[PDB]
Amino acid sequence: GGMVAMVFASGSHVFGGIGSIFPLFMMVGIMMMMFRGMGGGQQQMSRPKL
Amino acid sequence: MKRGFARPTPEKPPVIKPENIVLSTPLSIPPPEGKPWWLIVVGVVVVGLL
Numbered sequence: 001g002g003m004v005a006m007v008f009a010s011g012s013h014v015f016g017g018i019g020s021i022f023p024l025f026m027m028v029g030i031m032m033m034m035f036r037g038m039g040g041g042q043q044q045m046s047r048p049k050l
Numbered sequence: 051m052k053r054g055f056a057r058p059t060p061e062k063p064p065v066i067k068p069e070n071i072v073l074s075t076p077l078s079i080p081p082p083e084g085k086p087w088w089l090i091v092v093g094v095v096v097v098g099l100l
Contacts, residue, residue: 022099029096038086048084 004015004023015023039046 026096026099029092029099032092033089033096038089046084046086048082 007015
């Protein structure tokens with residue numbers, strides 16, 4: 001968010017409209033890795049073994 | 051009229067040797083360990099999108 005805010009304060013206004021799709025997709029992809037992700041050996045019942 | 055023939059003590063026959071053999075137990079198929087393939091696939095996209 002700081003990168004986008006820094007660019008907006010600087011005045012580039014490149015992310016307005018469809019340009020915003022880059023920050024949006026990235027922020028979603030980061031969400032998938034940190035919240036769901038996959039467990040280690042402590043979570044033995046990973047879908048392919050169960 | 052026939053020629054005489056006296057049978058001597060029998061000659062030693064070649065000795066037979068038995069053998070007790072226990073077979074090698076077969077190998078066991080390795081159980082299916084599995085990589086979290088999708089995680090690294092999202093990873094290379096996020097670093098690329100940056």
